[PDB]
């Protein structure tokens, strides 16, 4: 709809009377003026808003009776206007003509015809008038006509350039919001409820990701409400303009003042939340009201004395100091307060606190007679131009100070006062102490710097000056010793065959430095020096192992020598050699990139460009201290948020990009990268966020943990995405590396036993129902079936393998005592062996050993079990009706548990010893010692776990003695009723790793050679049921951990058997790099 | 003998030479013309007589004990050299005019360093001749790069611009060390400066114009051995003390004397590179220091400086 | 504070499964007021360290104590629907520290039964247990449990022998697993003949012989069917912290034979 509102800006210097002018025509006095409704903002006072947060007409007003001096005073205003809205209309009105002779009128008339109306650099003043007085005038009648017609003309001009007129149509929903924001009654008008207000007005502009940002954008430009977009009080805090302006302006007037006393007053004036108060102070900085000095003080630039304090400097002879001048036509408004804010952090030691003094127009730092610094404004007669003077003592520390000062000045101007980049830079020098200084432009000194000569007096050769004394910042004399270029080491040709690449900065060549391969950036005639120094500022102070460091810089040919990667870009590797890209290598690359991001984010630097092209590899050797680095720190791969082209980049944009990188690493084919070849789908795909399952879609081997990390990372909402610090913490995990698969079982399925086929599937029992039900899991497809095969509940399964006969059978022992034997090659071949006198408690198998609940052990001949109703070879009575057999272990002598005794068998099945273990109660606790044995692990000692024990007993089988206890509670006691500490199962690996499962979702990794805790693996599931060691169909060894996850959920987790080693190796890797980070940062 | 000898108010001396047999010839720096003054250390007498139109930049003693005569050679701003017999002040001789002003002298034969980097060599007995031509002239520097230090300590070390020369028995450049590479250490503004004083024992001690540090070079490998930080020593001392080095004197027992632009003189042990002691508030600005032997054969340091009303003061310091 | 009500705060405990805790019951219709005042005076002495002052919560007729996630001890009065006979209930986790806390508490309760009810010994002692976590508990009269203590076997379910319980869990204070490690009787070292030739003397609990415990002549006190088990540990309480050259040292107890081994010289 045809929006008919436009802002009116009234500006001028203090004393003009322009407020009354407005009243006759009809911080800041804001009010509507229906004529066309103008939103009039009367900047009667010094409301920095015109620079601190800069469809409007600029009415400039000045007092004619003051004259031409005032006209010149308006140049900074005109500059600022052009600098933010060069296309906007400007009407210049002089006033108080009734007390100003026409001499002044025509003097000022000629003044503006000579210096403003036809002068570039000013925003082409559209018209002008002279007014007798604010009482009314024919001139004002004409002015009213001028303003109306010209504002119409302006919008016509916008249509010619922008494409919008004074009835330009804007989405009506935005118009509605304006009205909704108008209707707001809040005591402390800081708004967050806006989300609700959207919901109050039905739900308009529902594209929160696009329309909402546009509405907000409009609302600031239209002068309705204020976002403050890195402040915390920014996005969710829309504040009424009247309060922003009023309160901050008043507090200024309510010069060093302690923060706390300001807080005291403020708390009485307006009871802001202390959180808001911290932001309040941050806003005072942002809006140039007050600058932070120490953490307890504010400078308050405005109102500082403007009578440069008497300063006596040490050093007097010309050669003792260095002087630099900046010639300007006028200082921009706010130039000084911004400059001061930057200069306050200067320090010659950053590579005692200084006696600081403030002039408003200058800063004096003292430090020491050895090194001090004075920056301030000075003006000479017959030179209308104003200008800066910088003075430092001529020595290395003085140089360092100078470098920091001029870098801040140039950066200030590039960001805030472009257009000037005027700024005639002069250096002062003399050929003899006691004489006057001579001026020279730095450009000419640069011409001489290229020669490398001494400055020579053209009339007298005897008089020369080393350039460094005049301009030690042209020659890079302020570099750290560590990066000064040694010209006897650097070896390069600048020949075509060494060209590695180029850019707007010049070119890059391959070279040698101190015997190493390096890259040399050359600033080959591209506004050099300034670009060079900008790069030097960024490169220094960033010293992380994952970044490309600077290996010395040198002004003689203007070079940056940097580390050259030996294996090249990740991109190439992804499309060059998947064999190098092992699972181990991939993980390490992810860590190194994550560190770089964490570091740069803590350094307040947004990378904005992660991709395989920017990742460099320095060795493909998986176990190296440093593998990947991020290039050039300081396309179709964009976050969907920033892809809109209407928001601001931040760490969350980088995180999103990182997630995509990880996705690209996961699928080593670079399949989405291949998608780039069809960019119309590729860029949109990323925008949609609808990425395909990396496993299913590309045929990529499973990698859980990472898979969910990517999903967690790539969220639509920036506020829901993980921080880069968190991303790293997640990557920092042995579990991440070694977890390979996780299969959930169907809801309410309880498996009490497992048999993996050593040849890729698992036979599962089922204790959920009370019926003999046998299930089956296909690891190749995660397929699952199940059928009832017996009456009573299946207790134990065993695999009979007869490779000689080319067949195999599953033996199912159950509660009834029967043995159901089923051919694995033929489901129809089912038969039952001689029924046992009691239930089957365990199976082992060659002989099929059947341990029953009455302590009886049946031994069946290897092949005999094929026949239905077959009897065992022999039967032993080991225990009794109350002492069931529960474990047959063997690692050709058998060992096992019967009640509280440990038995052992010969190859003739004879008892070789009955070890009563109950006697261990002299140690530990009798209710733990006196309990049925659950499992026996046979190594160089026996490891016994008993039912409901928290302690594992270690026995010396050679002497039958207790040789130690393992307290599981203790280990988890060190870890900060899920902590039952009950031992569930024991598994043993011959590399000394001992795997102990427990009641809660924890797995302890112990070191058999020292009996020490390697690591606690936890938050696995609700409870661990069984653990198996099994070789997969790809010959990999893994742990099969079956657990409960009560909603009776249960699941199978597959771990890479080398977990114990990965835990230790990863830890080492990280610590080494941690030390290197400190090494680098400390050198500086 | 720490004899505090004062000259008339506003007397300024730009050069000097002591007779090594008890008196000192001094150049009248306070005038606009080559005038040669003379100090009698036996009576503390002081006189003066004009010798040239341009000012005297350097004095040197020529002595022919086989001829039983001696002369003071006055190297002036004009480039001419006036030779004045000390046994007869009216017996004067003129040496061939140089292509630029004379910055330094060293006398067997007389070496003449000039502002345009030339080294004229005059055979000893040509001192008796007027309009005398030099034995040999070396092309060392140029109009932008003056020759100023003639330090024999039997070869000649030459301070010319930023380079160190070593001359043979037949005036061949044995060695040439450009000291600009020292910029990796210290500070470029100091490093890149004309060499004023060269002292040699086991190593070279280089005082450059307006430097607060002295470079130490290895004559055996032509490498920087280290730096002597004068302003640091003054920092240790609890614009009067700029620390700019004015002169280096050295006694065989490693007694390095460093006169600074202020009232402090540093005494440093070159066998360990340690500050031995400091002469405090000697004068307001020390100009030069000449090791000399008195009429009593006492080893003294002729510390000449100003107590600025510019007051020239010569202290016959007790070594 | 005796001014407090009998309130019983809803405190979530660790060890929520039946096998995770030990439950001891003392039945009697009423324990006259003043009983619990004397009880808490004795309960505020518990300390397993003696063989920490935790966030205890006195409940007037009992106390929470807290101790730790690992070991805790709740003691107090109880009553059930259709079971008007009141009773005391002790809950400690099934571990040695719990056993220690329990052992000290049950001795304090019986000390009170001797104090508050001198000669009454009602006061029925029951071991509350189950054969499976989540199941209903059953009670064993400790007199019968002691008959089974003599057997030394597990509680065996005669109808379903597959269900057995390690008796010391049922009653941690039955078998002295909560002694100072140095006085647990090593049954392989107690060379005790029990013949008349070894007689030293006698006492109300039985008789006193001697043995060659760990190769050293020691005195042996046999609690010969005159309130054995009980008197034995009560003597051990006296012996605990009893240290002087003029006194007879304890050279290991022995709950299995009910025979104390003492210094002999």
Short mmCIF file of N, CA, C and O in Angstrom, two decimals, chain A residues 639-735:
data_model
loop_
_atom_site.label_atom_id
_atom_site.label_comp_id
_atom_site.label_asym_id
_atom_site.label_seq_id
_atom_site.Cartn_x
_atom_site.Cartn_y
_atom_site.Cartn_z
N UNK A 639 25.16 -20.37 5.16
CA UNK A 639 24.07 -20.59 6.09
C UNK A 639 22.84 -20.00 5.43
O UNK A 639 22.97 -18.96 4.79
N UNK A 640 21.56 -20.65 5.58
CA UNK A 640 20.29 -20.21 5.02
C UNK A 640 19.88 -18.88 5.60
O UNK A 640 19.15 -18.13 4.96
N UNK A 641 20.35 -18.58 6.81
CA UNK A 641 20.07 -17.33 7.46
C UNK A 641 20.77 -16.18 6.75
O UNK A 641 20.13 -15.24 6.30
N UNK A 642 22.09 -16.29 6.59
CA UNK A 642 22.85 -15.24 5.92
C UNK A 642 22.65 -15.30 4.42
O UNK A 642 22.84 -14.29 3.73
N UNK A 643 22.20 -16.44 3.91
CA UNK A 643 21.88 -16.60 2.50
C UNK A 643 20.75 -15.67 2.08
O UNK A 643 20.59 -15.40 0.89
N UNK A 644 19.95 -15.17 3.04
CA UNK A 644 18.87 -14.26 2.74
C UNK A 644 19.40 -12.92 2.26
O UNK A 644 18.70 -12.20 1.54
N UNK A 645 20.62 -12.56 2.67
CA UNK A 645 21.22 -11.30 2.26
C UNK A 645 20.64 -10.11 3.01
O UNK A 645 20.67 -8.99 2.51
N UNK A 646 20.11 -10.35 4.20
CA UNK A 646 19.49 -9.27 4.96
C UNK A 646 19.75 -9.35 6.46
O UNK A 646 19.04 -8.73 7.25
N UNK A 647 20.77 -10.12 6.85
CA UNK A 647 21.17 -10.25 8.25
C UNK A 647 22.67 -10.04 8.38
O UNK A 647 23.36 -9.78 7.40
N UNK A 648 23.16 -10.15 9.61
CA UNK A 648 24.57 -9.96 9.92
C UNK A 648 25.25 -11.27 10.33
O UNK A 648 24.70 -12.04 11.12
N UNK A 649 26.46 -11.49 9.83
CA UNK A 649 27.22 -12.68 10.17
C UNK A 649 27.65 -12.73 11.61
O UNK A 649 27.98 -11.71 12.22
N UNK A 650 27.67 -13.93 12.15
CA UNK A 650 28.13 -14.15 13.50
C UNK A 650 28.58 -15.59 13.64
O UNK A 650 28.51 -16.35 12.68
N UNK A 651 29.04 -15.96 14.82
CA UNK A 651 29.56 -17.30 15.05
C UNK A 651 28.62 -18.42 14.64
O UNK A 651 29.08 -19.50 14.28
N UNK A 652 27.32 -18.18 14.66
CA UNK A 652 26.39 -19.23 14.36
C UNK A 652 26.40 -19.53 12.88
O UNK A 652 26.06 -20.64 12.47
N UNK A 653 26.77 -18.55 12.08
CA UNK A 653 26.89 -18.75 10.65
C UNK A 653 28.06 -19.67 10.39
O UNK A 653 27.96 -20.59 9.59
N UNK A 654 29.16 -19.42 11.10
CA UNK A 654 30.33 -20.29 10.95
C UNK A 654 30.03 -21.70 11.41
O UNK A 654 30.45 -22.66 10.77
N UNK A 655 29.29 -21.84 12.50
CA UNK A 655 28.95 -23.17 12.98
C UNK A 655 28.16 -23.93 11.96
O UNK A 655 28.46 -25.09 11.70
N UNK A 656 27.17 -23.29 11.36
CA UNK A 656 26.38 -23.95 10.35
C UNK A 656 27.27 -24.42 9.23
O UNK A 656 27.16 -25.56 8.76
N UNK A 657 28.16 -23.55 8.77
CA UNK A 657 29.08 -23.90 7.71
C UNK A 657 29.94 -25.09 8.11
O UNK A 657 30.15 -25.99 7.30
N UNK A 658 30.41 -25.10 9.35
CA UNK A 658 31.19 -26.22 9.87
C UNK A 658 30.44 -27.51 9.75
O UNK A 658 31.01 -28.52 9.34
N UNK A 659 29.18 -27.51 10.13
CA UNK A 659 28.37 -28.70 10.03
C UNK A 659 28.39 -29.23 8.61
O UNK A 659 28.53 -30.43 8.41
N UNK A 660 28.27 -28.35 7.63
CA UNK A 660 28.32 -28.79 6.26
C UNK A 660 29.67 -29.39 5.92
O UNK A 660 29.73 -30.39 5.22
N UNK A 661 30.74 -28.81 6.45
CA UNK A 661 32.07 -29.37 6.24
C UNK A 661 32.14 -30.78 6.77
O UNK A 661 32.66 -31.67 6.11
N UNK A 662 31.63 -30.98 7.97
CA UNK A 662 31.62 -32.29 8.59
C UNK A 662 30.83 -33.28 7.75
O UNK A 662 31.26 -34.41 7.58
N UNK A 663 29.68 -32.85 7.22
CA UNK A 663 28.86 -33.67 6.33
C UNK A 663 29.71 -34.08 5.13
O UNK A 663 29.68 -35.23 4.71
N UNK A 664 30.46 -33.13 4.59
CA UNK A 664 31.32 -33.39 3.45
C UNK A 664 32.44 -34.35 3.80
O UNK A 664 32.85 -35.15 2.96
N UNK A 665 32.95 -34.28 5.02
CA UNK A 665 33.97 -35.22 5.45
C UNK A 665 33.39 -36.61 5.60
O UNK A 665 34.00 -37.58 5.17
N UNK A 666 32.22 -36.69 6.21
CA UNK A 666 31.53 -37.95 6.43
C UNK A 666 31.35 -38.69 5.13
O UNK A 666 31.69 -39.87 5.03
N UNK A 667 30.83 -38.01 4.12
CA UNK A 667 30.72 -38.65 2.82
C UNK A 667 31.94 -38.30 2.03
O UNK A 667 31.97 -37.29 1.35
N UNK A 668 32.94 -39.18 2.06
CA UNK A 668 34.23 -38.92 1.43
C UNK A 668 34.17 -38.72 -0.06
O UNK A 668 35.08 -38.15 -0.65
N UNK A 669 33.08 -39.15 -0.69
CA UNK A 669 32.90 -38.92 -2.11
C UNK A 669 32.69 -37.45 -2.42
O UNK A 669 32.85 -37.03 -3.57
N UNK A 670 32.30 -36.65 -1.42
CA UNK A 670 32.06 -35.25 -1.65
C UNK A 670 30.83 -35.14 -2.51
O UNK A 670 30.79 -34.38 -3.47
N UNK A 671 29.83 -35.95 -2.19
CA UNK A 671 28.66 -36.04 -3.03
C UNK A 671 27.88 -34.74 -3.11
O UNK A 671 27.35 -34.41 -4.16
N UNK A 672 27.85 -33.97 -2.03
CA UNK A 672 27.15 -32.71 -2.14
C UNK A 672 28.03 -31.76 -2.96
O UNK A 672 27.52 -30.92 -3.70
N UNK A 673 29.35 -31.96 -2.88
CA UNK A 673 30.30 -31.17 -3.64
C UNK A 673 30.15 -31.49 -5.11
O UNK A 673 30.29 -30.61 -5.95
N UNK A 674 29.84 -32.74 -5.42
CA UNK A 674 29.56 -33.11 -6.80
C UNK A 674 28.27 -32.43 -7.24
O UNK A 674 28.15 -32.00 -8.38
N UNK A 675 27.33 -32.26 -6.30
CA UNK A 675 26.09 -31.54 -6.54
C UNK A 675 26.33 -30.11 -7.02
O UNK A 675 25.55 -29.60 -7.82
N UNK A 676 27.44 -29.49 -6.58
CA UNK A 676 27.87 -28.14 -7.03
C UNK A 676 27.85 -27.97 -8.54
O UNK A 676 27.60 -26.87 -9.03
N UNK A 677 28.14 -29.05 -9.27
CA UNK A 677 28.15 -29.06 -10.73
C UNK A 677 26.78 -28.70 -11.32
O UNK A 677 26.68 -28.34 -12.49
N UNK A 678 25.74 -28.78 -10.49
CA UNK A 678 24.38 -28.41 -10.84
C UNK A 678 23.92 -27.42 -9.76
O UNK A 678 22.99 -27.71 -9.00
N UNK A 679 24.56 -26.23 -9.72
CA UNK A 679 24.46 -25.17 -8.71
C UNK A 679 23.05 -24.67 -8.45
O UNK A 679 22.74 -24.20 -7.36
N UNK A 680 22.17 -24.83 -9.44
CA UNK A 680 20.79 -24.42 -9.31
C UNK A 680 20.06 -25.24 -8.26
O UNK A 680 19.11 -24.77 -7.64
N UNK A 681 20.51 -26.47 -8.07
CA UNK A 681 19.92 -27.34 -7.08
C UNK A 681 20.73 -27.28 -5.81
O UNK A 681 20.17 -27.31 -4.72
N UNK A 682 22.05 -27.19 -5.96
CA UNK A 682 23.00 -27.19 -4.85
C UNK A 682 22.81 -26.05 -3.86
O UNK A 682 22.67 -26.29 -2.65
N UNK A 683 22.80 -24.81 -4.34
CA UNK A 683 22.64 -23.67 -3.45
C UNK A 683 21.27 -23.70 -2.79
O UNK A 683 21.15 -23.42 -1.60
N UNK A 684 20.25 -24.07 -3.56
CA UNK A 684 18.90 -24.13 -3.03
C UNK A 684 18.75 -25.24 -2.02
O UNK A 684 18.04 -25.07 -1.03
N UNK A 685 19.41 -26.36 -2.26
CA UNK A 685 19.38 -27.48 -1.34
C UNK A 685 19.84 -27.06 0.04
O UNK A 685 19.19 -27.37 1.03
N UNK A 686 20.97 -26.35 0.08
CA UNK A 686 21.49 -25.89 1.35
C UNK A 686 20.53 -24.91 2.02
O UNK A 686 20.34 -24.95 3.23
N UNK A 687 19.91 -24.04 1.21
CA UNK A 687 18.89 -23.11 1.70
C UNK A 687 17.70 -23.85 2.28
O UNK A 687 17.19 -23.48 3.34
N UNK A 688 17.25 -24.90 1.60
CA UNK A 688 16.14 -25.71 2.07
C UNK A 688 16.50 -26.41 3.36
O UNK A 688 15.66 -26.56 4.25
N UNK A 689 17.76 -26.85 3.47
CA UNK A 689 18.25 -27.55 4.65
C UNK A 689 17.82 -29.01 4.61
O UNK A 689 18.02 -29.76 5.57
N UNK A 690 17.25 -29.44 3.49
CA UNK A 690 16.71 -30.76 3.37
C UNK A 690 17.73 -31.71 2.81
O UNK A 690 17.60 -32.19 1.69
N UNK A 691 18.76 -31.98 3.60
CA UNK A 691 19.80 -32.87 3.16
C UNK A 691 19.38 -34.31 3.37
O UNK A 691 18.70 -34.61 4.34
N UNK A 692 19.78 -35.20 2.48
CA UNK A 692 19.52 -36.62 2.49
C UNK A 692 20.39 -37.32 3.51
O UNK A 692 21.47 -36.84 3.86
N UNK A 693 19.92 -38.48 3.94
CA UNK A 693 20.63 -39.28 4.92
C UNK A 693 21.96 -39.74 4.36
O UNK A 693 21.99 -40.56 3.45
N UNK A 694 23.07 -39.27 4.91
CA UNK A 694 24.43 -39.50 4.45
C UNK A 694 24.79 -40.98 4.34
O UNK A 694 25.67 -41.35 3.56
N UNK A 695 24.11 -41.83 5.09
CA UNK A 695 24.36 -43.25 5.04
C UNK A 695 23.58 -43.88 3.93
O UNK A 695 24.15 -44.45 3.01
N UNK A 696 22.27 -43.76 4.03
CA UNK A 696 21.36 -44.35 3.07
C UNK A 696 21.54 -43.82 1.67
O UNK A 696 21.56 -44.59 0.71
N UNK A 697 21.65 -42.51 1.55
CA UNK A 697 21.75 -41.87 0.26
C UNK A 697 23.06 -42.09 -0.45
O UNK A 697 23.08 -42.18 -1.68
N UNK A 698 24.17 -42.14 0.27
CA UNK A 698 25.43 -42.25 -0.43
C UNK A 698 26.09 -43.60 -0.25
O UNK A 698 27.11 -43.87 -0.89
N UNK A 699 25.53 -44.45 0.60
CA UNK A 699 26.11 -45.77 0.83
C UNK A 699 27.33 -45.63 1.72
O UNK A 699 28.36 -46.28 1.51
N UNK A 700 27.23 -44.75 2.71
CA UNK A 700 28.34 -44.46 3.60
C UNK A 700 28.26 -45.28 4.87
O UNK A 700 27.21 -45.33 5.50
N UNK A 701 29.35 -45.94 5.24
CA UNK A 701 29.35 -46.76 6.44
C UNK A 701 28.93 -45.92 7.65
O UNK A 701 29.44 -44.81 7.82
N UNK A 702 28.05 -46.44 8.51
CA UNK A 702 27.47 -45.80 9.68
C UNK A 702 28.51 -45.19 10.58
O UNK A 702 29.59 -45.75 10.78
N UNK A 703 28.16 -44.05 11.13
CA UNK A 703 29.02 -43.36 12.06
C UNK A 703 28.18 -42.52 12.99
O UNK A 703 28.22 -41.29 12.89
N UNK A 704 27.38 -43.16 13.85
CA UNK A 704 26.50 -42.54 14.82
C UNK A 704 27.33 -41.61 15.65
O UNK A 704 28.55 -41.63 15.54
N UNK A 705 26.70 -40.80 16.48
CA UNK A 705 27.38 -39.73 17.22
C UNK A 705 27.69 -38.59 16.25
O UNK A 705 27.11 -37.51 16.38
N UNK A 706 28.54 -38.82 15.24
CA UNK A 706 28.78 -37.82 14.21
C UNK A 706 27.53 -37.54 13.45
O UNK A 706 27.22 -36.38 13.18
N UNK A 707 26.79 -38.58 13.11
CA UNK A 707 25.55 -38.37 12.38
C UNK A 707 24.61 -37.46 13.15
O UNK A 707 24.01 -36.56 12.56
N UNK A 708 24.47 -37.67 14.45
CA UNK A 708 23.57 -36.79 15.17
C UNK A 708 24.20 -35.45 15.40
O UNK A 708 23.48 -34.46 15.50
N UNK A 709 25.52 -35.38 15.43
CA UNK A 709 26.18 -34.09 15.58
C UNK A 709 25.84 -33.20 14.43
O UNK A 709 25.52 -32.04 14.63
N UNK A 710 25.92 -33.74 13.22
CA UNK A 710 25.58 -32.97 12.04
C UNK A 710 24.15 -32.50 12.12
O UNK A 710 23.86 -31.35 11.83
N UNK A 711 23.24 -33.38 12.53
CA UNK A 711 21.85 -32.98 12.65
C UNK A 711 21.67 -31.87 13.68
O UNK A 711 20.91 -30.93 13.47
N UNK A 712 22.39 -31.97 14.80
CA UNK A 712 22.32 -30.97 15.84
C UNK A 712 22.90 -29.66 15.38
O UNK A 712 22.41 -28.59 15.72
N UNK A 713 23.97 -29.75 14.63
CA UNK A 713 24.63 -28.58 14.12
C UNK A 713 23.80 -27.84 13.11
O UNK A 713 23.60 -26.64 13.23
N UNK A 714 23.31 -28.54 12.10
CA UNK A 714 22.59 -27.88 11.03
C UNK A 714 21.11 -27.65 11.33
O UNK A 714 20.24 -28.25 10.70
N UNK A 715 20.84 -26.76 12.26
CA UNK A 715 19.48 -26.38 12.58
C UNK A 715 19.16 -25.08 11.89
O UNK A 715 20.07 -24.31 11.58
N UNK A 716 17.89 -24.84 11.67
CA UNK A 716 17.47 -23.62 10.99
C UNK A 716 17.66 -22.38 11.85
O UNK A 716 18.08 -21.35 11.34
N UNK A 717 17.34 -22.50 13.13
CA UNK A 717 17.41 -21.40 14.08
C UNK A 717 18.80 -21.19 14.68
O UNK A 717 19.26 -22.04 15.44
N UNK A 718 19.48 -20.07 14.38
CA UNK A 718 20.77 -19.64 14.88
C UNK A 718 20.88 -19.71 16.39
O UNK A 718 21.95 -19.95 16.93
N UNK A 719 19.77 -19.53 17.09
CA UNK A 719 19.82 -19.55 18.53
C UNK A 719 19.76 -20.96 19.08
O UNK A 719 19.97 -21.17 20.28
N UNK A 720 19.47 -21.93 18.23
CA UNK A 720 19.42 -23.31 18.64
C UNK A 720 20.67 -24.06 18.24
O UNK A 720 20.95 -25.13 18.79
N UNK A 721 21.43 -23.51 17.31
CA UNK A 721 22.65 -24.18 16.90
C UNK A 721 23.72 -24.10 18.01
O UNK A 721 23.82 -23.08 18.70
N UNK A 722 24.52 -25.16 18.20
CA UNK A 722 25.61 -25.32 19.16
C UNK A 722 26.67 -24.25 19.00
O UNK A 722 26.89 -23.77 17.90
N UNK A 723 27.34 -23.89 20.09
CA UNK A 723 28.42 -22.93 19.96
C UNK A 723 29.63 -23.68 19.51
O UNK A 723 29.71 -24.89 19.70
N UNK A 724 30.60 -22.97 18.95
CA UNK A 724 31.80 -23.63 18.45
C UNK A 724 32.62 -24.26 19.55
O UNK A 724 33.31 -25.26 19.32
N UNK A 725 32.53 -23.72 20.75
CA UNK A 725 33.22 -24.32 21.88
C UNK A 725 32.62 -25.69 22.16
O UNK A 725 33.35 -26.66 22.36
N UNK A 726 31.29 -25.75 22.14
CA UNK A 726 30.59 -27.00 22.37
C UNK A 726 30.86 -28.01 21.29
O UNK A 726 31.01 -29.19 21.58
N UNK A 727 30.94 -27.55 20.05
CA UNK A 727 31.23 -28.45 18.95
C UNK A 727 32.53 -29.15 19.19
O UNK A 727 32.63 -30.36 19.01
N UNK A 728 33.54 -28.39 19.60
CA UNK A 728 34.81 -29.01 19.89
C UNK A 728 34.70 -30.02 21.00
O UNK A 728 35.22 -31.12 20.87
N UNK A 729 34.05 -29.65 22.09
CA UNK A 729 33.91 -30.57 23.21
C UNK A 729 33.28 -31.88 22.79
O UNK A 729 33.69 -32.94 23.25
N UNK A 730 32.32 -31.82 21.89
CA UNK A 730 31.70 -33.01 21.37
C UNK A 730 32.69 -33.83 20.57
O UNK A 730 32.74 -35.05 20.71
N UNK A 731 33.47 -33.17 19.73
CA UNK A 731 34.46 -33.88 18.94
C UNK A 731 35.55 -34.50 19.80
O UNK A 731 36.12 -35.53 19.46
N UNK A 732 35.81 -33.88 20.94
CA UNK A 732 36.78 -34.39 21.90
C UNK A 732 36.22 -35.60 22.65
O UNK A 732 35.80 -35.48 23.80
N UNK A 733 36.24 -36.76 22.01
CA UNK A 733 35.68 -37.97 22.60
C UNK A 733 36.13 -39.27 22.00
O UNK A 733 36.03 -39.49 20.80
N UNK A 734 36.62 -40.17 22.84
CA UNK A 734 37.03 -41.47 22.36
C UNK A 734 35.82 -42.27 21.93
O UNK A 734 35.89 -43.04 20.97
N UNK A 735 34.70 -42.07 22.63
CA UNK A 735 33.46 -42.76 22.32
C UNK A 735 32.99 -42.39 20.94
O UNK A 735 32.54 -43.24 20.17
#
